Amino acid sequence: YLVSAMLLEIPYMAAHESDARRRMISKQFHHQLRVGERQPLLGPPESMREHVVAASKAMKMGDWKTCHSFIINEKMNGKVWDLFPEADKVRTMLVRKIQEESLRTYLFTYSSVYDSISMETLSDMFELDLPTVHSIISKMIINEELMASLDQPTQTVVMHRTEPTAQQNLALQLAEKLGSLVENNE
Amino acid sequence: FPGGRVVRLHPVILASIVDSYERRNEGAARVIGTLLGTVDKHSVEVTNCFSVPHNESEDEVAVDMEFAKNMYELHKKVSPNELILGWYATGHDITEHSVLIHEYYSREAPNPIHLTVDTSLQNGRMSIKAYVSTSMGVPGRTMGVMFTPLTVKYAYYDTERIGVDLIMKTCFSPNRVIGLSSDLQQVGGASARIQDALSTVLQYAEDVLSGKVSADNTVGRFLMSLVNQVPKIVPDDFETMLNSNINDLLMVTYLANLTQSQIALNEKLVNL
Amino acid sequence: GGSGDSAVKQVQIDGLVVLKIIKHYQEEGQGTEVVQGVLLGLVVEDRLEITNCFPFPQHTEDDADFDEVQYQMEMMRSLRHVNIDHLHVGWYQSTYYGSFVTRALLDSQFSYQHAIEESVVLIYDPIKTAQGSLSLKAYRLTPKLMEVCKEKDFSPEALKKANITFEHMFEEVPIVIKNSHLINVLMWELEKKSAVADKHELLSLASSNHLGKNLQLLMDRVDEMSQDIVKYNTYMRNTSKQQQQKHQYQQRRQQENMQRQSRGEPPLPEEDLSKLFKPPQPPARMDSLLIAGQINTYCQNIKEFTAQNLGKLFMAQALQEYNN
């Protein structure tokens, strides 16, 4: 959920040739291919209904359903560290939900705020000034920076330009195939 | 309120009129059928029809109502759109034989809805006058009927009547479809020049004295309605936008032609 | 003009024939295998001009199941009563697909044209063609198909007929050229609706204003046609690698299986040599997948010719009209 529903919600908008073929989709095709769901009861849906909001980031909504009724059902009690594994989890919920609007909701976002982003989700400014810096180099995102002002101008334009590149998801898988045709021929 | 106001058919009623009339089984003068459609209880919205066996003359007429039920059986199966609302004949209106086919359809006996197609050398008279028959008390003779007019409306699938618009282009001179959109540019040109020749006489009539009466704030209202949608006011950043779209659209069809070549290089290396 | 090979003719679609199609245009069946019916006319002056044709109404809500043929012959006896015979000169369809020829009905209409050489199959699609040339096309399963038969069989009798090499798309016949004189009455309605009753003619003129307002005429079409490319053309290339995984790749070490034992023993068998060369399930090109293969990679060609006339004449009208 933190190495798949985050690492791979970047290339899932029409760039499929990095899909790791052993993940939650073991079970994510199951507890989604059901005609009825509500407030989850099992482990996996109670490990999903905060994941589904970890797509609509909601730092509030996702942190509030790994600590709902698990401290009886072995999350907090059992992991023999009384409260701290949540202080770990909460942090990897707080932080891994600032790395989301960055990767998902950036379309009309040109001028954005990175002081108020610290006020929204309550992580340390340096522990947000690090990953907001990481967001550019580590994930090669189309967004510019002058971080004496603590800002990230985007100038992304890819939206109906990645559609003709979503034609190159397959226009490559035409002319990437002619590379493989005459390997067999001779 | 009276139900006899309007029939909103469309030219597919005239389709199963004319093909049926011009094959006819040599039913020389009078081809007739039973019309099937819907009603708005004021309007009569109709989709289709069919020509039946008849031998209408003085004083013999036949409408095989067993066969009209057979055709309705096949028609309701074809599409569930329609009920047999009455009968449509070719020429002409109120006859003593119409009222014989009335009592044949008062075996059927919904609201009598008739559609009389004049077969004459005219223009001013309509090629169809749709009729309903009220009063309609009638426990007497054959059927006391009173032919009240249904206005002839073509109100269905607009792209169908675009199909009919092409049929009316073929009515003038066909007009085969290979370069449809290619020579719809010639159609769009002819339209834009009729607008020009319209606007010119409107101006030059008042340039002398007393012209552009029915144009000033109607054609002038719909001259600023031209520039509402084309052109965009005067943005040269919109020139840049659509010459950048030209870059996009050329490059869509550009690799379309790279796939065109690749069609042959893929499936015809098969032929070695 | 539109004469075919040894028997078959052009089709003349009169203006009330397209109306017999556009009465069931797309109503009851959006993404369904709509068989818009059987076109019946007669062998007339070089072009079998259509009389009538009614849509053969399969179990029409979700799926497509061919009806009782009681309807077929009883309806076309219903026609026999005051009209022409069931002179079924083919079958016709819509079918929410501009620029295709289907696999199952390809086989069905080949077998139709096998019974009667003098037959064509009309495909009228509405402005879903993308406007978008050639809405009506009367395709026929070709006379090369007709010669080498039956029929285009897959594992054998595929390359064994692609040796002479059947033509696949040939004589997509012309449709509507002449004043058929089923017109003078339509001209008599045309003049009436061009005259004082000019509400409905202008309704259709105005109707095309909103087919470009909100519709993705290009975007949704080039999307579905591009996903037809990624699926069809690329699995076609996997078929190209897999028929190579068999004819030469596997065959190469079938040869090294034959040769490494000095091609058998003098005094005895020659068990291993005869046992080996176990021919892979493709021994000759798998050229019936690849038939519709070519025809559906050319469906992409006439779909990219669609995409051509979409972008070219739209941006033609932009750069010619706007400059004000």
mmCIF file with all atom_site columns, N, CA and C in Angstrom, chain B residues 19-20 22 24-25 48 67 71 78-79 118 122 154 158 160-162 167 174 176 178 231-232 235 253 256 259-260 262-263 267-268, chain C residues 15 22-23 25 28 51-52 57 71 78 80-83 131 133 176-177 181 188 191 200 204 207 237 290 294 297 304 312 322 324:
data_model
loop_
_atom_site.group_PDB
_atom_site.id
_atom_site.type_symbol
_atom_site.label_atom_id
_atom_site.label_alt_id
_atom_site.label_comp_id
_atom_site.label_asym_id
_atom_site.label_entity_id
_atom_site.label_seq_id
_atom_site.pdbx_PDB_ins_code
_atom_site.Cartn_x
_atom_site.Cartn_y
_atom_site.Cartn_z
_atom_site.occupancy
_atom_site.B_iso_or_equiv
_atom_site.pdbx_formal_charge
_atom_site.auth_seq_id
_atom_site.auth_comp_id
_atom_site.auth_asym_id
_atom_site.auth_atom_id
_atom_site.pdbx_PDB_model_num
ATOM 1   N N  . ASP B 1 19  ? -41.840 3.509   -52.795 1.00 0.00 ? 19  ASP B N  1
ATOM 2   C CA . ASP B 1 19  ? -41.298 2.183   -53.207 1.00 0.00 ? 19  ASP B CA 1
ATOM 3   C C  . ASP B 1 19  ? -42.473 1.230   -53.449 1.00 0.00 ? 19  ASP B C  1
ATOM 4   N N  . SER B 1 20  ? -43.390 1.169   -52.482 1.00 0.00 ? 20  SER B N  1
ATOM 5   C CA . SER B 1 20  ? -44.633 0.358   -52.524 1.00 0.00 ? 20  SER B CA 1
ATOM 6   C C  . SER B 1 20  ? -45.515 0.792   -53.701 1.00 0.00 ? 20  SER B C  1
ATOM 7   N N  . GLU B 1 22  ? -44.470 2.338   -56.511 1.00 0.00 ? 22  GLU B N  1
ATOM 8   C CA . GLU B 1 22  ? -43.761 2.242   -57.819 1.00 0.00 ? 22  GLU B CA 1
ATOM 9   C C  . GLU B 1 22  ? -43.316 0.798   -58.107 1.00 0.00 ? 22  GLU B C  1
ATOM 10  N N  . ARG B 1 24  ? -45.880 -1.971  -56.572 1.00 0.00 ? 24  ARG B N  1
ATOM 11  C CA . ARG B 1 24  ? -47.362 -1.778  -56.599 1.00 0.00 ? 24  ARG B CA 1
ATOM 12  C C  . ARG B 1 24  ? -48.142 -3.074  -56.884 1.00 0.00 ? 24  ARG B C  1
ATOM 13  N N  . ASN B 1 25  ? -47.507 -4.125  -57.425 1.00 0.00 ? 25  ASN B N  1
ATOM 14  C CA . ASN B 1 25  ? -48.175 -5.331  -57.997 1.00 0.00 ? 25  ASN B CA 1
ATOM 15  C C  . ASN B 1 25  ? -49.186 -4.899  -59.073 1.00 0.00 ? 25  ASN B C  1
ATOM 16  N N  . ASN B 1 48  ? -42.867 4.803   -39.075 1.00 0.00 ? 48  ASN B N  1
ATOM 17  C CA . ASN B 1 48  ? -42.916 3.862   -40.230 1.00 0.00 ? 48  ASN B CA 1
ATOM 18  C C  . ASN B 1 48  ? -44.356 3.727   -40.748 1.00 0.00 ? 48  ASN B C  1
ATOM 19  N N  . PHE B 1 67  ? -54.336 -9.793  -42.498 1.00 0.00 ? 67  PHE B N  1
ATOM 20  C CA . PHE B 1 67  ? -52.979 -9.494  -43.027 1.00 0.00 ? 67  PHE B CA 1
ATOM 21  C C  . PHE B 1 67  ? -52.402 -8.243  -42.346 1.00 0.00 ? 67  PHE B C  1
ATOM 22  N N  . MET B 1 71  ? -49.024 -8.125  -40.509 1.00 0.00 ? 71  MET B N  1
ATOM 23  C CA . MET B 1 71  ? -47.979 -7.093  -40.749 1.00 0.00 ? 71  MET B CA 1
ATOM 24  C C  . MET B 1 71  ? -47.628 -6.386  -39.434 1.00 0.00 ? 71  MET B C  1
ATOM 25  N N  . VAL B 1 78  ? -40.258 -6.006  -35.621 1.00 0.00 ? 78  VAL B N  1
ATOM 26  C CA . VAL B 1 78  ? -39.236 -5.134  -36.288 1.00 0.00 ? 78  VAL B CA 1
ATOM 27  C C  . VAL B 1 78  ? -38.822 -4.026  -35.312 1.00 0.00 ? 78  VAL B C  1
ATOM 28  N N  . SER B 1 79  ? -39.799 -3.267  -34.807 1.00 0.00 ? 79  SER B N  1
ATOM 29  C CA . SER B 1 79  ? -39.614 -2.209  -33.780 1.00 0.00 ? 79  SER B CA 1
ATOM 30  C C  . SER B 1 79  ? -40.887 -2.070  -32.950 1.00 0.00 ? 79  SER B C  1
ATOM 31  N N  . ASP B 1 118 ? -52.144 13.089  -52.363 1.00 0.00 ? 118 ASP B N  1
ATOM 32  C CA . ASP B 1 118 ? -52.583 13.611  -53.688 1.00 0.00 ? 118 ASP B CA 1
ATOM 33  C C  . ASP B 1 118 ? -51.556 13.199  -54.751 1.00 0.00 ? 118 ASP B C  1
ATOM 34  N N  . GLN B 1 122 ? -48.989 19.171  -59.420 1.00 0.00 ? 122 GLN B N  1
ATOM 35  C CA . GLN B 1 122 ? -49.128 20.471  -58.701 1.00 0.00 ? 122 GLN B CA 1
ATOM 36  C C  . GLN B 1 122 ? -47.865 20.787  -57.886 1.00 0.00 ? 122 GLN B C  1
ATOM 37  N N  . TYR B 1 154 ? -42.397 16.943  -40.024 1.00 0.00 ? 154 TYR B N  1
ATOM 38  C CA . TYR B 1 154 ? -41.251 15.991  -40.037 1.00 0.00 ? 154 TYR B CA 1
ATOM 39  C C  . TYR B 1 154 ? -40.367 16.242  -38.808 1.00 0.00 ? 154 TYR B C  1
ATOM 40  N N  . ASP B 1 158 ? -32.731 13.991  -36.264 1.00 0.00 ? 158 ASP B N  1
ATOM 41  C CA . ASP B 1 158 ? -32.308 15.162  -37.078 1.00 0.00 ? 158 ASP B CA 1
ATOM 42  C C  . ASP B 1 158 ? -31.250 14.727  -38.101 1.00 0.00 ? 158 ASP B C  1
ATOM 43  N N  . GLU B 1 160 ? -31.179 11.773  -39.421 1.00 0.00 ? 160 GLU B N  1
ATOM 44  C CA . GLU B 1 160 ? -31.994 11.049  -40.436 1.00 0.00 ? 160 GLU B CA 1
ATOM 45  C C  . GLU B 1 160 ? -32.434 12.032  -41.522 1.00 0.00 ? 160 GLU B C  1
ATOM 46  N N  . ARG B 1 161 ? -33.001 13.171  -41.116 1.00 0.00 ? 161 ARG B N  1
ATOM 47  C CA . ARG B 1 161 ? -33.465 14.242  -42.038 1.00 0.00 ? 161 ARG B CA 1
ATOM 48  C C  . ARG B 1 161 ? -32.262 14.985  -42.642 1.00 0.00 ? 161 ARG B C  1
ATOM 49  N N  . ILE B 1 162 ? -31.060 14.853  -42.062 1.00 0.00 ? 162 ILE B N  1
ATOM 50  C CA . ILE B 1 162 ? -29.761 15.196  -42.725 1.00 0.00 ? 162 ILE B CA 1
ATOM 51  C C  . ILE B 1 162 ? -29.511 14.171  -43.840 1.00 0.00 ? 162 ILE B C  1
ATOM 52  N N  . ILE B 1 167 ? -30.721 13.169  -49.671 1.00 0.00 ? 167 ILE B N  1
ATOM 53  C CA . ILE B 1 167 ? -31.712 12.573  -50.621 1.00 0.00 ? 167 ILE B CA 1
ATOM 54  C C  . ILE B 1 167 ? -32.322 13.698  -51.474 1.00 0.00 ? 167 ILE B C  1
ATOM 55  N N  . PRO B 1 174 ? -27.970 13.599  -58.167 1.00 0.00 ? 174 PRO B N  1
ATOM 56  C CA . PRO B 1 174 ? -27.105 12.788  -57.306 1.00 0.00 ? 174 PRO B CA 1
ATOM 57  C C  . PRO B 1 174 ? -25.667 12.935  -57.805 1.00 0.00 ? 174 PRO B C  1
ATOM 58  N N  . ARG B 1 176 ? -23.389 11.353  -55.350 1.00 0.00 ? 176 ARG B N  1
ATOM 59  C CA . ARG B 1 176 ? -22.873 10.121  -54.693 1.00 0.00 ? 176 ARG B CA 1
ATOM 60  C C  . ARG B 1 176 ? -21.890 10.541  -53.592 1.00 0.00 ? 176 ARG B C  1
ATOM 61  N N  . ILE B 1 178 ? -18.441 9.856   -51.885 1.00 0.00 ? 178 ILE B N  1
ATOM 62  C CA . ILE B 1 178 ? -17.027 9.408   -51.689 1.00 0.00 ? 178 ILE B CA 1
ATOM 63  C C  . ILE B 1 178 ? -16.294 10.501  -50.900 1.00 0.00 ? 178 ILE B C  1
ATOM 64  N N  . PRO B 1 231 ? -15.519 34.619  -36.578 1.00 0.00 ? 231 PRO B N  1
ATOM 65  C CA . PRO B 1 231 ? -14.286 34.376  -35.823 1.00 0.00 ? 231 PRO B CA 1
ATOM 66  C C  . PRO B 1 231 ? -14.416 34.513  -34.299 1.00 0.00 ? 231 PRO B C  1
ATOM 67  N N  . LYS B 1 232 ? -13.452 33.958  -33.559 1.00 0.00 ? 232 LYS B N  1
ATOM 68  C CA . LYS B 1 232 ? -13.069 34.432  -32.202 1.00 0.00 ? 232 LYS B CA 1
ATOM 69  C C  . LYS B 1 232 ? -12.664 35.909  -32.329 1.00 0.00 ? 232 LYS B C  1
ATOM 70  N N  . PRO B 1 235 ? -8.253  37.578  -31.322 1.00 0.00 ? 235 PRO B N  1
ATOM 71  C CA . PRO B 1 235 ? -7.038  37.174  -30.613 1.00 0.00 ? 235 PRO B CA 1
ATOM 72  C C  . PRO B 1 235 ? -6.017  36.500  -31.542 1.00 0.00 ? 235 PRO B C  1
ATOM 73  N N  . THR B 1 253 ? -2.512  12.491  -37.867 1.00 0.00 ? 253 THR B N  1
ATOM 74  C CA . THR B 1 253 ? -2.601  11.835  -39.202 1.00 0.00 ? 253 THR B CA 1
ATOM 75  C C  . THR B 1 253 ? -1.197  11.514  -39.738 1.00 0.00 ? 253 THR B C  1
ATOM 76  N N  . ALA B 1 256 ? -0.524  8.303   -38.341 1.00 0.00 ? 256 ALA B N  1
ATOM 77  C CA . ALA B 1 256 ? -1.570  7.543   -39.068 1.00 0.00 ? 256 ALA B CA 1
ATOM 78  C C  . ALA B 1 256 ? -0.991  7.036   -40.397 1.00 0.00 ? 256 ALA B C  1
ATOM 79  N N  . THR B 1 259 ? 1.690   4.472   -39.635 1.00 0.00 ? 259 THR B N  1
ATOM 80  C CA . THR B 1 259 ? 0.972   3.183   -39.430 1.00 0.00 ? 259 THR B CA 1
ATOM 81  C C  . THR B 1 259 ? 0.541   2.625   -40.796 1.00 0.00 ? 259 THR B C  1
ATOM 82  N N  . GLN B 1 260 ? 0.135   3.490   -41.740 1.00 0.00 ? 260 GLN B N  1
ATOM 83  C CA . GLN B 1 260 ? -0.261  3.116   -43.132 1.00 0.00 ? 260 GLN B CA 1
ATOM 84  C C  . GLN B 1 260 ? 0.853   2.296   -43.789 1.00 0.00 ? 260 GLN B C  1
ATOM 85  N N  . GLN B 1 262 ? 3.409   0.931   -42.135 1.00 0.00 ? 262 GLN B N  1
ATOM 86  C CA . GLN B 1 262 ? 3.663   -0.196  -41.194 1.00 0.00 ? 262 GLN B CA 1
ATOM 87  C C  . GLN B 1 262 ? 2.634   -1.319  -41.402 1.00 0.00 ? 262 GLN B C  1
ATOM 88  N N  . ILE B 1 263 ? 1.425   -1.012  -41.899 1.00 0.00 ? 263 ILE B N  1
ATOM 89  C CA . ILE B 1 263 ? 0.387   -2.026  -42.271 1.00 0.00 ? 263 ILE B CA 1
ATOM 90  C C  . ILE B 1 263 ? 0.997   -2.985  -43.303 1.00 0.00 ? 263 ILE B C  1
ATOM 91  N N  . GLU B 1 267 ? 2.054   -6.945  -42.254 1.00 0.00 ? 267 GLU B N  1
ATOM 92  C CA . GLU B 1 267 ? 1.158   -8.050  -42.695 1.00 0.00 ? 267 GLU B CA 1
ATOM 93  C C  . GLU B 1 267 ? 1.541   -8.543  -44.098 1.00 0.00 ? 267 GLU B C  1
ATOM 94  N N  . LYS B 1 268 ? 2.434   -7.857  -44.820 1.00 0.00 ? 268 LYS B N  1
ATOM 95  C CA . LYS B 1 268 ? 2.779   -8.209  -46.227 1.00 0.00 ? 268 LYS B CA 1
ATOM 96  C C  . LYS B 1 268 ? 4.210   -8.773  -46.316 1.00 0.00 ? 268 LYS B C  1
ATOM 97  N N  . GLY C 2 15  ? -33.075 7.012   -52.393 1.00 0.00 ? 15  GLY C N  1
ATOM 98  C CA . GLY C 2 15  ? -33.072 7.879   -51.201 1.00 0.00 ? 15  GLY C CA 1
ATOM 99  C C  . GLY C 2 15  ? -33.978 7.392   -50.080 1.00 0.00 ? 15  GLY C C  1
ATOM 100 N N  . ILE C 2 22  ? -32.151 4.281   -41.600 1.00 0.00 ? 22  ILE C N  1
ATOM 101 C CA . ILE C 2 22  ? -32.033 5.348   -40.555 1.00 0.00 ? 22  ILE C CA 1
ATOM 102 C C  . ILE C 2 22  ? -33.339 5.425   -39.739 1.00 0.00 ? 22  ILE C C  1
ATOM 103 N N  . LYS C 2 23  ? -34.373 4.636   -40.059 1.00 0.00 ? 23  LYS C N  1
ATOM 104 C CA . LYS C 2 23  ? -35.543 4.439   -39.152 1.00 0.00 ? 23  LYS C CA 1
ATOM 105 C C  . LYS C 2 23  ? -35.140 3.527   -37.983 1.00 0.00 ? 23  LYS C C  1
ATOM 106 N N  . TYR C 2 25  ? -31.570 3.296   -37.482 1.00 0.00 ? 25  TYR C N  1
ATOM 107 C CA . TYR C 2 25  ? -30.223 3.922   -37.356 1.00 0.00 ? 25  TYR C CA 1
ATOM 108 C C  . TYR C 2 25  ? -29.398 3.291   -36.223 1.00 0.00 ? 25  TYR C C  1
ATOM 109 N N  . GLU C 2 28  ? -32.763 0.831   -30.455 1.00 0.00 ? 28  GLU C N  1
ATOM 110 C CA . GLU C 2 28  ? -32.663 -0.579  -29.971 1.00 0.00 ? 28  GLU C CA 1
ATOM 111 C C  . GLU C 2 28  ? -31.380 -1.230  -30.522 1.00 0.00 ? 28  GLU C C  1
ATOM 112 N N  . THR C 2 51  ? -35.249 -2.006  -53.968 1.00 0.00 ? 51  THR C N  1
ATOM 113 C CA . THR C 2 51  ? -36.706 -1.778  -53.814 1.00 0.00 ? 51  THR C CA 1
ATOM 114 C C  . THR C 2 51  ? -36.969 -1.471  -52.336 1.00 0.00 ? 51  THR C C  1
ATOM 115 N N  . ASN C 2 52  ? -36.886 -2.492  -51.476 1.00 0.00 ? 52  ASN C N  1
ATOM 116 C CA . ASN C 2 52  ? -37.134 -2.395  -50.011 1.00 0.00 ? 52  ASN C CA 1
ATOM 117 C C  . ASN C 2 52  ? -36.103 -3.245  -49.260 1.00 0.00 ? 52  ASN C C  1
ATOM 118 N N  . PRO C 2 57  ? -35.120 -8.200  -36.932 1.00 0.00 ? 57  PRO C N  1
ATOM 119 C CA . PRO C 2 57  ? -35.007 -7.711  -35.558 1.00 0.00 ? 57  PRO C CA 1
ATOM 120 C C  . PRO C 2 57  ? -34.691 -8.809  -34.532 1.00 0.00 ? 57  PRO C C  1
ATOM 121 N N  . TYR C 2 71  ? -40.635 -15.087 -39.859 1.00 0.00 ? 71  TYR C N  1
ATOM 122 C CA . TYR C 2 71  ? -40.702 -13.618 -40.101 1.00 0.00 ? 71  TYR C CA 1
ATOM 123 C C  . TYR C 2 71  ? -40.152 -13.321 -41.501 1.00 0.00 ? 71  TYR C C  1
ATOM 124 N N  . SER C 2 78  ? -45.519 -10.877 -47.334 1.00 0.00 ? 78  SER C N  1
ATOM 125 C CA . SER C 2 78  ? -46.232 -9.602  -47.049 1.00 0.00 ? 78  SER C CA 1
ATOM 126 C C  . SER C 2 78  ? -45.849 -8.554  -48.105 1.00 0.00 ? 78  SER C C  1
ATOM 127 N N  . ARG C 2 80  ? -44.527 -9.631  -51.209 1.00 0.00 ? 80  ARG C N  1
ATOM 128 C CA . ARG C 2 80  ? -45.039 -10.328 -52.432 1.00 0.00 ? 80  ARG C CA 1
ATOM 129 C C  . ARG C 2 80  ? -46.486 -9.916  -52.740 1.00 0.00 ? 80  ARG C C  1
ATOM 130 N N  . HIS C 2 81  ? -47.280 -9.603  -51.707 1.00 0.00 ? 81  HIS C N  1
ATOM 131 C CA . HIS C 2 81  ? -48.746 -9.361  -51.788 1.00 0.00 ? 81  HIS C CA 1
ATOM 132 C C  . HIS C 2 81  ? -49.061 -8.145  -52.675 1.00 0.00 ? 81  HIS C C  1
ATOM 133 N N  . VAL C 2 82  ? -48.384 -7.006  -52.468 1.00 0.00 ? 82  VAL C N  1
ATOM 134 C CA . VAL C 2 82  ? -48.600 -5.747  -53.254 1.00 0.00 ? 82  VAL C CA 1
ATOM 135 C C  . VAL C 2 82  ? -47.264 -5.190  -53.784 1.00 0.00 ? 82  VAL C C  1
ATOM 136 N N  . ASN C 2 83  ? -46.152 -5.934  -53.688 1.00 0.00 ? 83  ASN C N  1
ATOM 137 C CA . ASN C 2 83  ? -44.781 -5.427  -53.991 1.00 0.00 ? 83  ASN C CA 1
ATOM 138 C C  . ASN C 2 83  ? -43.905 -6.562  -54.549 1.00 0.00 ? 83  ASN C C  1
ATOM 139 N N  . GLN C 2 131 ? -17.470 12.140  -39.602 1.00 0.00 ? 131 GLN C N  1
ATOM 140 C CA . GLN C 2 131 ? -17.571 13.181  -40.662 1.00 0.00 ? 131 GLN C CA 1
ATOM 141 C C  . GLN C 2 131 ? -16.180 13.626  -41.124 1.00 0.00 ? 131 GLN C C  1
ATOM 142 N N  . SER C 2 133 ? -15.574 10.555  -44.112 1.00 0.00 ? 133 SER C N  1
ATOM 143 C CA . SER C 2 133 ? -16.049 10.233  -45.484 1.00 0.00 ? 133 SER C CA 1
ATOM 144 C C  . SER C 2 133 ? -16.675 8.835   -45.522 1.00 0.00 ? 133 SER C C  1
ATOM 145 N N  . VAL C 2 176 ? -25.051 5.430   -55.184 1.00 0.00 ? 176 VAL C N  1
ATOM 146 C CA . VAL C 2 176 ? -26.226 6.294   -55.543 1.00 0.00 ? 176 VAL C CA 1
ATOM 147 C C  . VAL C 2 176 ? -25.784 7.437   -56.473 1.00 0.00 ? 176 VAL C C  1
ATOM 148 N N  . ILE C 2 177 ? -26.093 7.337   -57.775 1.00 0.00 ? 177 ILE C N  1
ATOM 149 C CA . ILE C 2 177 ? -25.588 8.263   -58.842 1.00 0.00 ? 177 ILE C CA 1
ATOM 150 C C  . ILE C 2 177 ? -26.737 8.867   -59.675 1.00 0.00 ? 177 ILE C C  1
ATOM 151 N N  . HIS C 2 181 ? -36.129 8.253   -60.337 1.00 0.00 ? 181 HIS C N  1
ATOM 152 C CA . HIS C 2 181 ? -37.553 8.601   -60.621 1.00 0.00 ? 181 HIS C CA 1
ATOM 153 C C  . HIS C 2 181 ? -38.480 7.961   -59.572 1.00 0.00 ? 181 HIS C C  1
ATOM 154 N N  . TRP C 2 188 ? -41.112 16.792  -54.753 1.00 0.00 ? 188 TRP C N  1
ATOM 155 C CA . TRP C 2 188 ? -42.442 17.414  -54.507 1.00 0.00 ? 188 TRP C CA 1
ATOM 156 C C  . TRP C 2 188 ? -42.642 17.715  -53.011 1.00 0.00 ? 188 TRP C C  1
ATOM 157 N N  . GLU C 2 191 ? -39.588 20.712  -52.409 1.00 0.00 ? 191 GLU C N  1
ATOM 158 C CA . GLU C 2 191 ? -40.074 22.053  -52.839 1.00 0.00 ? 191 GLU C CA 1
ATOM 159 C C  . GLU C 2 191 ? -41.052 22.608  -51.793 1.00 0.00 ? 191 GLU C C  1
ATOM 160 N N  . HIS C 2 200 ? -38.441 22.487  -40.790 1.00 0.00 ? 200 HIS C N  1
ATOM 161 C CA . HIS C 2 200 ? -37.887 21.115  -40.615 1.00 0.00 ? 200 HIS C CA 1
ATOM 162 C C  . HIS C 2 200 ? -36.563 20.974  -41.376 1.00 0.00 ? 200 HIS C C  1
ATOM 163 N N  . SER C 2 204 ? -32.723 20.410  -39.425 1.00 0.00 ? 204 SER C N  1
ATOM 164 C CA . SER C 2 204 ? -31.612 19.484  -39.787 1.00 0.00 ? 204 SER C CA 1
ATOM 165 C C  . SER C 2 204 ? -30.330 20.271  -40.083 1.00 0.00 ? 204 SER C C  1
ATOM 166 N N  . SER C 2 207 ? -29.080 21.274  -36.710 1.00 0.00 ? 207 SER C N  1
ATOM 167 C CA . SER C 2 207 ? -28.854 20.081  -35.849 1.00 0.00 ? 207 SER C CA 1
ATOM 168 C C  . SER C 2 207 ? -27.364 19.732  -35.742 1.00 0.00 ? 207 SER C C  1
ATOM 169 N N  . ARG C 2 237 ? 1.750   -8.596  -34.165 1.00 0.00 ? 237 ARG C N  1
ATOM 170 C CA . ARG C 2 237 ? 3.241   -8.642  -34.117 1.00 0.00 ? 237 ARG C CA 1
ATOM 171 C C  . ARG C 2 237 ? 3.701   -9.807  -33.230 1.00 0.00 ? 237 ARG C C  1
ATOM 172 N N  . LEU C 2 290 ? -4.623  -14.034 -40.070 1.00 0.00 ? 290 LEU C N  1
ATOM 173 C CA . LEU C 2 290 ? -3.836  -12.981 -40.767 1.00 0.00 ? 290 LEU C CA 1
ATOM 174 C C  . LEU C 2 290 ? -4.619  -12.403 -41.954 1.00 0.00 ? 290 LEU C C  1
ATOM 175 N N  . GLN C 2 294 ? -4.958  -8.595  -42.132 1.00 0.00 ? 294 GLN C N  1
ATOM 176 C CA . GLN C 2 294 ? -4.754  -7.549  -43.174 1.00 0.00 ? 294 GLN C CA 1
ATOM 177 C C  . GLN C 2 294 ? -5.975  -6.630  -43.246 1.00 0.00 ? 294 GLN C C  1
ATOM 178 N N  . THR C 2 297 ? -6.238  -4.428  -40.104 1.00 0.00 ? 297 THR C N  1
ATOM 179 C CA . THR C 2 297 ? -5.121  -3.440  -40.132 1.00 0.00 ? 297 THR C CA 1
ATOM 180 C C  . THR C 2 297 ? -5.350  -2.437  -41.270 1.00 0.00 ? 297 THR C C  1
ATOM 181 N N  . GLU C 2 304 ? -7.861  5.656   -40.224 1.00 0.00 ? 304 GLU C N  1
ATOM 182 C CA . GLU C 2 304 ? -6.801  6.701   -40.160 1.00 0.00 ? 304 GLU C CA 1
ATOM 183 C C  . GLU C 2 304 ? -7.029  7.706   -41.302 1.00 0.00 ? 304 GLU C C  1
ATOM 184 N N  . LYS C 2 312 ? -7.866  17.605  -41.037 1.00 0.00 ? 312 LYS C N  1
ATOM 185 C CA . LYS C 2 312 ? -7.369  18.390  -42.202 1.00 0.00 ? 312 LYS C CA 1
ATOM 186 C C  . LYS C 2 312 ? -8.386  19.470  -42.595 1.00 0.00 ? 312 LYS C C  1
ATOM 187 N N  . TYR C 2 322 ? -11.659 32.092  -39.683 1.00 0.00 ? 322 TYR C N  1
ATOM 188 C CA . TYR C 2 322 ? -11.459 32.889  -38.439 1.00 0.00 ? 322 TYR C CA 1
ATOM 189 C C  . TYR C 2 322 ? -10.791 34.247  -38.727 1.00 0.00 ? 322 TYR C C  1
ATOM 190 N N  . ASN C 2 324 ? -10.255 37.257  -38.876 1.00 0.00 ? 324 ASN C N  1
ATOM 191 C CA . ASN C 2 324 ? -11.087 38.494  -38.882 1.00 0.00 ? 324 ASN C CA 1
ATOM 192 C C  . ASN C 2 324 ? -11.132 39.097  -37.474 1.00 0.00 ? 324 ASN C C  1
#
